[PDB]
Amino acid sequence: NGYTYEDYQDTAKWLLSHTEQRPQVAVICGSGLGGLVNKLTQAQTFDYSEIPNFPESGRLVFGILNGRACVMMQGRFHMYEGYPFWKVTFPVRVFRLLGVETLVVTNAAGGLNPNFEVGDIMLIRDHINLPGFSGENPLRGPNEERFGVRFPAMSDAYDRDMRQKAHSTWKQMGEQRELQEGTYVMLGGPNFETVAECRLLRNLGADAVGMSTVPEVIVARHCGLRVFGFSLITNKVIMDYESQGKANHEEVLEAGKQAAQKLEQFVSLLMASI
Amino acid sequence: NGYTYEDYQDTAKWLLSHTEQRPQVAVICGSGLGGLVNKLTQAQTFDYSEIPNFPESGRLVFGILNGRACVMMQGRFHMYEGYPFWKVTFPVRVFRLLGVETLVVTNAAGGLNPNFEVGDIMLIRDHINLPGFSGENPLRGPNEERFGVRFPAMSDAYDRDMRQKAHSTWKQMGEQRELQEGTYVMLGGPNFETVAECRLLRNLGADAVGMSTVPEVIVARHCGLRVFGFSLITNKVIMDYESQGKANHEEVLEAGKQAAQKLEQFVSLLMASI
Amino acid sequence: NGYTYEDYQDTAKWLLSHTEQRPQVAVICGSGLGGLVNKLTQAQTFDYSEIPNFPESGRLVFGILNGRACVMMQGRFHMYEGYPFWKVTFPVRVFRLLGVETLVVTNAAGGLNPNFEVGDIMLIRDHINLPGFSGENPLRGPNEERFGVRFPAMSDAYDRDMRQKAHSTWKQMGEQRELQEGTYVMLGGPNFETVAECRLLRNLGADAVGMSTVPEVIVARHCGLRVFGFSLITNKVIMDYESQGKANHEEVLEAGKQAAQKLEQFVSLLMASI
Ligand SMILES: Nc1nc2c(ncn2[C@@H]2O[C@H](CO)[C@H]3O[C@@H](CP(=O)(O)O)O[C@H]32)c(=O)[nH]1
Ligand SMILES: Nc1nc2c(ncn2[C@@H]2O[C@H](CO)[C@H]3O[C@@H](CP(=O)(O)O)O[C@H]32)c(=O)[nH]1
Ligand SMILES: Nc1nc2c(ncn2[C@@H]2O[C@H](CO)[C@H]3O[C@@H](CP(=O)(O)O)O[C@H]32)c(=O)[nH]1
Ligand SMILES: [Mg+2]
Ligand SMILES: [Mg+2]
Ligand SMILES: [Mg+2]
Ligand SMILES: [Zn+2]
Ligand SMILES: [Zn+2]
Ligand SMILES: [Zn+2]
């Protein structure tokens, strides 16, 4: 970890003096889900480049969403960009110092569960942190008690209540396709998985595969934030050597557009119940 | 590896000139098992801070245990503290240069095998080194032949004889609960595993999960030491989403106390047969 | 990645001005397969030490093989030597800048599939990149579009045509033992796997285990090279605690000799069909 506690304080102090907004909820927008910030009222935006200590991208937007004061990350950071996890998760700790209590994380992922279909929304019930198995963890290094404990529990990371409410809200939305729910596995990237890797991951019990999120959740749980999140299934991963095609970022961004209005609508409603 | 061969020599030379003790056996005490050093006779202690080149913590204690000359590490180092494995395992190589022939490793672990119960003692028959799958290995870097070979075998790491004797000794102890035996899997930490991760690990064939030991064993085998070890089962990991509770370091330390007298007693007897 | 684009250019320019050879095919020789370079005609060799920017070993040999212009790496680099993957794979990108279109990779591996026998040749149909699960990837860091895309597909890494031709060619060779085909899994090393690790890997769907290759393939696919490869099964890994013996580098090198003439013969013929 290359940031001191004071670094975190300085950055939060800077934000508090540049906007009157006082967020209670923070949202990290995954790839293609950035349009969510366009629904905020009384909004104020800061490019990451203008914020002291912020990792290099990228906009941070404050505002009101369906009655709730929020702060959203339009664009996030990734391990595959070369950033260590202490940089990838720097914003989560700043949010805590701002007074945020709940964190919503979203991402684009590849579907491992055969029952999934492109466009599906999968609530995240649990995760598998592969980089963590080898020590790549945002918490690696001396522990800072002002944030949390040395050995944080992670079995209850994704708030159960929020998931119930989430299912309730989706009911009131009157959607034809059911709201999915499963386990998200994170791996480094940036390349897409081979057939052997996809089969393996599925056998490990994962329902969706991605390249982010997990480190943010771990840090959020460590400092005390309530966590909720979901994945937009952007493609069904190739499970056999009879590959009619192969994963590509184009289709991932395409799928991101088709389900924009939908995803944005869902998150907007969930604010009500927090 | 940031230590030269001379660094290892200098440190061993320093220890040999500050104590008359000449250990044949070395013991690394895991969390909560530190009371073991209190049974040594003609003991001499050195805080790690007073020993040149030693990683920063932490006491090294020399003495006689049930007739055998020993040197024990009261407190060990971990990857989750930010230390690279070449630092975590520095003492093992120093021990070899001191004349030590056998290494006993102990640790606190979470139980994956359903038949295990808190308090159980599980002899370590084999291990799974997850960090090693990605290259995080104390042997990474140019090989130093003065210590061992470039490609060391690890399938016979845990001495079979010692395990037989271990079972024999436990018999003479007249314990009601049987002595367990299984596979130990090491992951980075510092957070506790999620339900998905626990299920996965069990399916990989692991019986107990921890955050240390494996790197020490690998280095000990590389330089020629005989190895024996075991885990104190401090908690039964949550295997379902009907979690009545969740892992916590408090209970781990609590369990460490209840089985202190027992664990300490067992190790004391095992010295006889080496 | 510690090499700039210009570094790659400078090195390729140097090679182009020191030899009249213009390779279309590149071959990376694994351990014990180095004798392959002895069949090249009109050959020219450069020790890696004489080539600007080349990682420290090691010879690069240009020449004609059964009618095809080739460049071969007699000796490769490994993660267990302490080299980051951007160093291990530096040559692959230089080859691309030289005008190479196809890459052949070979290695020595341990057999996981029970049907395999020492000496068997296993064509590589797919792979499992364990280090990649944690982020150790030659592509980690800012993407260089002059080489390839940010998110490269890997499900079609091993050219299907080449595999068909490979099987065809092996037919014309009239060999008694069939040509094997399976999945190669790469782990860091340098130690050999324990029994628990071997069982685990097999259950993940791997047929052979090694310490190289995968990173080279990923980089070759990223910059557009056609890829073909195979493993020489140098030993049957210990799958039970009734180990009659244990893996050793001696036997691996021994097996490498016995199948030299065979392996060398096979590769020589495959050139014809490219
Ligand atoms: N590991 C993996 N990641 C995928 C796949 N499909 C989508 N992704 C995610 O979207 C991008 C590639 O199109 C990657 O970058 C990030 C985007 P995120 O910030 O997680 O929304 O995770 C990966 C996929 O199939 N596998
Ligand atoms: N991975 C993991 N580690 C655990 C668990 N229970 C105990 N541990 C070990 O004890 C501490 C947490 O209480 C951690 O720190 C070290 C202690 P050690 O030096 O291995 O005796 O390994 C972990 C557990 O459930 N999972
Ligand atoms: N992981 C692993 N690697 C093995 C085994 N048998 C052979 N190897 C490979 O050969 C050497 C050890 O003798 C190691 O170094 C490299 C050689 P390579 O450049 O891949 O041909 O991969 C390993 C084996 O059983 N397991
Ligand atoms: Mg800046
Ligand atoms: Mg000191
Ligand atoms: Mg040089
Ligand atoms: Zn200002
Ligand atoms: Zn002195
Ligand atoms: Zn010259």
PDB file of N, CA, C and O in Angstrom, chain A residues 147-191:
ATOM      1  N   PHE A 147      -9.171   2.022   9.803  1.00  0.00           N
ATOM      2  CA  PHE A 147     -10.075   1.584   8.740  1.00  0.00           C
ATOM      3  C   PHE A 147     -10.799   0.285   9.118  1.00  0.00           C
ATOM      4  O   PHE A 147     -12.018   0.171   8.959  1.00  0.00           O
ATOM      5  N   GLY A 148     -10.047  -0.696   9.612  1.00  0.00           N
ATOM      6  CA  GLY A 148     -10.653  -1.967   9.974  1.00  0.00           C
ATOM      7  C   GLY A 148      -9.720  -2.952  10.656  1.00  0.00           C
ATOM      8  O   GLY A 148      -8.608  -2.590  11.059  1.00  0.00           O
ATOM      9  N   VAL A 149     -10.174  -4.203  10.769  1.00  0.00           N
ATOM     10  CA  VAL A 149      -9.425  -5.268  11.437  1.00  0.00           C
ATOM     11  C   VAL A 149      -8.407  -6.011  10.559  1.00  0.00           C
ATOM     12  O   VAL A 149      -8.502  -6.004   9.334  1.00  0.00           O
ATOM     13  N   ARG A 150      -7.437  -6.654  11.205  1.00  0.00           N
ATOM     14  CA  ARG A 150      -6.396  -7.398  10.496  1.00  0.00           C
ATOM     15  C   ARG A 150      -6.967  -8.545   9.667  1.00  0.00           C
ATOM     16  O   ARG A 150      -6.568  -8.733   8.521  1.00  0.00           O
ATOM     17  N   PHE A 151      -7.899  -9.307  10.244  1.00  0.00           N
ATOM     18  CA  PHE A 151      -8.501 -10.450   9.544  1.00  0.00           C
ATOM     19  C   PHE A 151     -10.003 -10.319   9.341  1.00  0.00           C
ATOM     20  O   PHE A 151     -10.786 -10.935  10.071  1.00  0.00           O
ATOM     21  N   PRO A 152     -10.430  -9.539   8.337  1.00  0.00           N
ATOM     22  CA  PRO A 152     -11.856  -9.343   8.057  1.00  0.00           C
ATOM     23  C   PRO A 152     -12.574 -10.547   7.449  1.00  0.00           C
ATOM     24  O   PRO A 152     -12.031 -11.249   6.589  1.00  0.00           O
ATOM     25  N   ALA A 153     -13.803 -10.774   7.906  1.00  0.00           N
ATOM     26  CA  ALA A 153     -14.620 -11.869   7.404  1.00  0.00           C
ATOM     27  C   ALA A 153     -15.168 -11.416   6.060  1.00  0.00           C
ATOM     28  O   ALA A 153     -15.376 -10.221   5.840  1.00  0.00           O
ATOM     29  N   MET A 154     -15.404 -12.365   5.163  1.00  0.00           N
ATOM     30  CA  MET A 154     -15.886 -12.036   3.832  1.00  0.00           C
ATOM     31  C   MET A 154     -17.069 -12.907   3.418  1.00  0.00           C
ATOM     32  O   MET A 154     -17.630 -12.728   2.337  1.00  0.00           O
ATOM     33  N   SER A 155     -17.455 -13.845   4.280  1.00  0.00           N
ATOM     34  CA  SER A 155     -18.563 -14.740   3.964  1.00  0.00           C
ATOM     35  C   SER A 155     -19.920 -14.031   3.921  1.00  0.00           C
ATOM     36  O   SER A 155     -20.875 -14.560   3.362  1.00  0.00           O
ATOM     37  N   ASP A 156     -19.997 -12.840   4.509  1.00  0.00           N
ATOM     38  CA  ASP A 156     -21.237 -12.061   4.529  1.00  0.00           C
ATOM     39  C   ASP A 156     -21.045 -10.710   3.827  1.00  0.00           C
ATOM     40  O   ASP A 156     -21.702  -9.721   4.158  1.00  0.00           O
ATOM     41  N   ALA A 157     -20.154 -10.689   2.842  1.00  0.00           N
ATOM     42  CA  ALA A 157     -19.828  -9.475   2.094  1.00  0.00           C
ATOM     43  C   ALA A 157     -20.994  -8.798   1.378  1.00  0.00           C
ATOM     44  O   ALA A 157     -21.143  -7.578   1.441  1.00  0.00           O
ATOM     45  N   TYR A 158     -21.805  -9.586   0.686  1.00  0.00           N
ATOM     46  CA  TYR A 158     -22.935  -9.053  -0.056  1.00  0.00           C
ATOM     47  C   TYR A 158     -24.208  -9.069   0.797  1.00  0.00           C
ATOM     48  O   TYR A 158     -24.868 -10.102   0.949  1.00  0.00           O
ATOM     49  N   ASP A 159     -24.527  -7.904   1.351  1.00  0.00           N
ATOM     50  CA  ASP A 159     -25.688  -7.721   2.221  1.00  0.00           C
ATOM     51  C   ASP A 159     -26.945  -8.485   1.803  1.00  0.00           C
ATOM     52  O   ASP A 159     -27.484  -8.285   0.718  1.00  0.00           O
ATOM     53  N   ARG A 160     -27.410  -9.361   2.690  1.00  0.00           N
ATOM     54  CA  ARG A 160     -28.598 -10.171   2.428  1.00  0.00           C
ATOM     55  C   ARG A 160     -29.876  -9.342   2.252  1.00  0.00           C
ATOM     56  O   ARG A 160     -30.684  -9.615   1.361  1.00  0.00           O
ATOM     57  N   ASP A 161     -30.065  -8.335   3.100  1.00  0.00           N
ATOM     58  CA  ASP A 161     -31.256  -7.494   3.001  1.00  0.00           C
ATOM     59  C   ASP A 161     -31.359  -6.890   1.603  1.00  0.00           C
ATOM     60  O   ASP A 161     -32.363  -7.066   0.913  1.00  0.00           O
ATOM     61  N   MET A 162     -30.309  -6.183   1.190  1.00  0.00           N
ATOM     62  CA  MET A 162     -30.264  -5.557  -0.129  1.00  0.00           C
ATOM     63  C   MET A 162     -30.677  -6.508  -1.246  1.00  0.00           C
ATOM     64  O   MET A 162     -31.330  -6.099  -2.204  1.00  0.00           O
ATOM     65  N   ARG A 163     -30.280  -7.774  -1.124  1.00  0.00           N
ATOM     66  CA  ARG A 163     -30.610  -8.786  -2.129  1.00  0.00           C
ATOM     67  C   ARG A 163     -32.104  -9.101  -2.114  1.00  0.00           C
ATOM     68  O   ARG A 163     -32.705  -9.369  -3.160  1.00  0.00           O
ATOM     69  N   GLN A 164     -32.698  -9.084  -0.926  1.00  0.00           N
ATOM     70  CA  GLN A 164     -34.127  -9.340  -0.806  1.00  0.00           C
ATOM     71  C   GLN A 164     -34.838  -8.155  -1.446  1.00  0.00           C
ATOM     72  O   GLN A 164     -35.703  -8.323  -2.305  1.00  0.00           O
ATOM     73  N   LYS A 165     -34.458  -6.950  -1.033  1.00  0.00           N
ATOM     74  CA  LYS A 165     -35.061  -5.742  -1.588  1.00  0.00           C
ATOM     75  C   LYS A 165     -34.875  -5.748  -3.105  1.00  0.00           C
ATOM     76  O   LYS A 165     -35.813  -5.482  -3.857  1.00  0.00           O
ATOM     77  N   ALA A 166     -33.660  -6.062  -3.549  1.00  0.00           N
ATOM     78  CA  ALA A 166     -33.355  -6.110  -4.975  1.00  0.00           C
ATOM     79  C   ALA A 166     -34.368  -6.987  -5.701  1.00  0.00           C
ATOM     80  O   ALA A 166     -34.905  -6.596  -6.735  1.00  0.00           O
ATOM     81  N   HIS A 167     -34.619  -8.180  -5.166  1.00  0.00           N
ATOM     82  CA  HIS A 167     -35.586  -9.085  -5.778  1.00  0.00           C
ATOM     83  C   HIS A 167     -36.995  -8.485  -5.712  1.00  0.00           C
ATOM     84  O   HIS A 167     -37.772  -8.614  -6.659  1.00  0.00           O
ATOM     85  N   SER A 168     -37.317  -7.824  -4.601  1.00  0.00           N
ATOM     86  CA  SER A 168     -38.629  -7.190  -4.444  1.00  0.00           C
ATOM     87  C   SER A 168     -38.805  -6.118  -5.525  1.00  0.00           C
ATOM     88  O   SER A 168     -39.798  -6.110  -6.254  1.00  0.00           O
ATOM     89  N   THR A 169     -37.828  -5.220  -5.623  1.00  0.00           N
ATOM     90  CA  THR A 169     -37.859  -4.137  -6.605  1.00  0.00           C
ATOM     91  C   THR A 169     -37.999  -4.641  -8.034  1.00  0.00           C
ATOM     92  O   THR A 169     -38.748  -4.071  -8.824  1.00  0.00           O
ATOM     93  N   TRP A 170     -37.274  -5.702  -8.370  1.00  0.00           N
ATOM     94  CA  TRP A 170     -37.332  -6.258  -9.717  1.00  0.00           C
ATOM     95  C   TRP A 170     -38.733  -6.787  -9.992  1.00  0.00           C
ATOM     96  O   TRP A 170     -39.179  -6.824 -11.138  1.00  0.00           O
ATOM     97  N   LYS A 171     -39.424  -7.191  -8.929  1.00  0.00           N
ATOM     98  CA  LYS A 171     -40.786  -7.699  -9.052  1.00  0.00           C
ATOM     99  C   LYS A 171     -41.712  -6.564  -9.484  1.00  0.00           C
ATOM    100  O   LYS A 171     -42.498  -6.708 -10.420  1.00  0.00           O
ATOM    101  N   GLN A 172     -41.595  -5.431  -8.800  1.00  0.00           N
ATOM    102  CA  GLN A 172     -42.415  -4.260  -9.090  1.00  0.00           C
ATOM    103  C   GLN A 172     -42.143  -3.713 -10.492  1.00  0.00           C
ATOM    104  O   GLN A 172     -42.970  -2.999 -11.058  1.00  0.00           O
ATOM    105  N   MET A 173     -40.985  -4.055 -11.051  1.00  0.00           N
ATOM    106  CA  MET A 173     -40.610  -3.600 -12.389  1.00  0.00           C
ATOM    107  C   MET A 173     -41.359  -4.340 -13.489  1.00  0.00           C
ATOM    108  O   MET A 173     -41.462  -3.853 -14.614  1.00  0.00           O
ATOM    109  N   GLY A 174     -41.870  -5.522 -13.165  1.00  0.00           N
ATOM    110  CA  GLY A 174     -42.606  -6.297 -14.148  1.00  0.00           C
ATOM    111  C   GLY A 174     -41.792  -6.696 -15.368  1.00  0.00           C
ATOM    112  O   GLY A 174     -42.177  -6.406 -16.502  1.00  0.00           O
ATOM    113  N   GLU A 175     -40.663  -7.359 -15.134  1.00  0.00           N
ATOM    114  CA  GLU A 175     -39.793  -7.821 -16.212  1.00  0.00           C
ATOM    115  C   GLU A 175     -40.144  -9.263 -16.564  1.00  0.00           C
ATOM    116  O   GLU A 175     -40.489 -10.056 -15.685  1.00  0.00           O
ATOM    117  N   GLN A 176     -40.057  -9.600 -17.848  1.00  0.00           N
ATOM    118  CA  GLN A 176     -40.367 -10.952 -18.295  1.00  0.00           C
ATOM    119  C   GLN A 176     -39.303 -11.953 -17.862  1.00  0.00           C
ATOM    120  O   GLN A 176     -39.620 -12.994 -17.286  1.00  0.00           O
ATOM    121  N   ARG A 177     -38.043 -11.637 -18.139  1.00  0.00           N
ATOM    122  CA  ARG A 177     -36.942 -12.518 -17.769  1.00  0.00           C
ATOM    123  C   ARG A 177     -36.654 -12.368 -16.281  1.00  0.00           C
ATOM    124  O   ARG A 177     -36.643 -11.255 -15.755  1.00  0.00           O
ATOM    125  N   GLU A 178     -36.435 -13.488 -15.599  1.00  0.00           N
ATOM    126  CA  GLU A 178     -36.142 -13.448 -14.172  1.00  0.00           C
ATOM    127  C   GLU A 178     -34.780 -12.826 -13.895  1.00  0.00           C
ATOM    128  O   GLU A 178     -33.899 -12.809 -14.756  1.00  0.00           O
ATOM    129  N   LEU A 179     -34.625 -12.310 -12.683  1.00  0.00           N
ATOM    130  CA  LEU A 179     -33.377 -11.705 -12.248  1.00  0.00           C
ATOM    131  C   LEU A 179     -32.474 -12.846 -11.787  1.00  0.00           C
ATOM    132  O   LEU A 179     -32.835 -13.586 -10.870  1.00  0.00           O
ATOM    133  N   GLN A 180     -31.315 -12.999 -12.425  1.00  0.00           N
ATOM    134  CA  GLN A 180     -30.385 -14.069 -12.065  1.00  0.00           C
ATOM    135  C   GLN A 180     -29.632 -13.780 -10.769  1.00  0.00           C
ATOM    136  O   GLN A 180     -29.640 -12.656 -10.272  1.00  0.00           O
ATOM    137  N   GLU A 181     -28.977 -14.803 -10.228  1.00  0.00           N
ATOM    138  CA  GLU A 181     -28.220 -14.668  -8.989  1.00  0.00           C
ATOM    139  C   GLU A 181     -27.168 -15.775  -8.955  1.00  0.00           C
ATOM    140  O   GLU A 181     -27.485 -16.941  -9.188  1.00  0.00           O
ATOM    141  N   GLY A 182     -25.921 -15.416  -8.666  1.00  0.00           N
ATOM    142  CA  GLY A 182     -24.870 -16.418  -8.639  1.00  0.00           C
ATOM    143  C   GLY A 182     -23.529 -15.931  -8.123  1.00  0.00           C
ATOM    144  O   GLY A 182     -23.428 -14.858  -7.528  1.00  0.00           O
ATOM    145  N   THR A 183     -22.495 -16.728  -8.370  1.00  0.00           N
ATOM    146  CA  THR A 183     -21.143 -16.420  -7.910  1.00  0.00           C
ATOM    147  C   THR A 183     -20.274 -15.805  -9.001  1.00  0.00           C
ATOM    148  O   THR A 183     -20.214 -16.307 -10.124  1.00  0.00           O
ATOM    149  N   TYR A 184     -19.589 -14.721  -8.651  1.00  0.00           N
ATOM    150  CA  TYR A 184     -18.713 -14.023  -9.590  1.00  0.00           C
ATOM    151  C   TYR A 184     -17.256 -14.355  -9.294  1.00  0.00           C
ATOM    152  O   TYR A 184     -16.808 -14.236  -8.157  1.00  0.00           O
ATOM    153  N   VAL A 185     -16.520 -14.779 -10.318  1.00  0.00           N
ATOM    154  CA  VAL A 185     -15.109 -15.086 -10.131  1.00  0.00           C
ATOM    155  C   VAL A 185     -14.257 -14.042 -10.843  1.00  0.00           C
ATOM    156  O   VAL A 185     -14.515 -13.692 -11.995  1.00  0.00           O
ATOM    157  N   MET A 186     -13.241 -13.541 -10.160  1.00  0.00           N
ATOM    158  CA  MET A 186     -12.383 -12.540 -10.766  1.00  0.00           C
ATOM    159  C   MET A 186     -11.006 -13.089 -11.092  1.00  0.00           C
ATOM    160  O   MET A 186     -10.394 -13.787 -10.277  1.00  0.00           O
ATOM    161  N   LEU A 187     -10.548 -12.809 -12.309  1.00  0.00           N
ATOM    162  CA  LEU A 187      -9.203 -13.181 -12.718  1.00  0.00           C
ATOM    163  C   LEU A 187      -8.552 -11.928 -13.316  1.00  0.00           C
ATOM    164  O   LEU A 187      -9.245 -10.960 -13.670  1.00  0.00           O
ATOM    165  N   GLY A 188      -7.227 -11.942 -13.408  1.00  0.00           N
ATOM    166  CA  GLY A 188      -6.488 -10.792 -13.907  1.00  0.00           C
ATOM    167  C   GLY A 188      -6.735 -10.195 -15.285  1.00  0.00           C
ATOM    168  O   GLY A 188      -6.848  -8.972 -15.411  1.00  0.00           O
ATOM    169  N   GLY A 189      -6.810 -11.031 -16.314  1.00  0.00           N
ATOM    170  CA  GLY A 189      -6.987 -10.512 -17.660  1.00  0.00           C
ATOM    171  C   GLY A 189      -5.627 -10.051 -18.180  1.00  0.00           C
ATOM    172  O   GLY A 189      -4.608 -10.333 -17.539  1.00  0.00           O
ATOM    173  N   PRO A 190      -5.566  -9.282 -19.283  1.00  0.00           N
ATOM    174  CA  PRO A 190      -6.659  -8.768 -20.122  1.00  0.00           C
ATOM    175  C   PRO A 190      -7.207  -9.683 -21.217  1.00  0.00           C
ATOM    176  O   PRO A 190      -8.170  -9.310 -21.903  1.00  0.00           O
ATOM    177  N   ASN A 191      -6.599 -10.849 -21.423  1.00  0.00           N
ATOM    178  CA  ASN A 191      -7.095 -11.759 -22.457  1.00  0.00           C
ATOM    179  C   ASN A 191      -8.340 -12.510 -22.004  1.00  0.00           C
ATOM    180  O   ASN A 191      -8.588 -12.657 -20.803  1.00  0.00           O
TER     181      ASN A 191
END
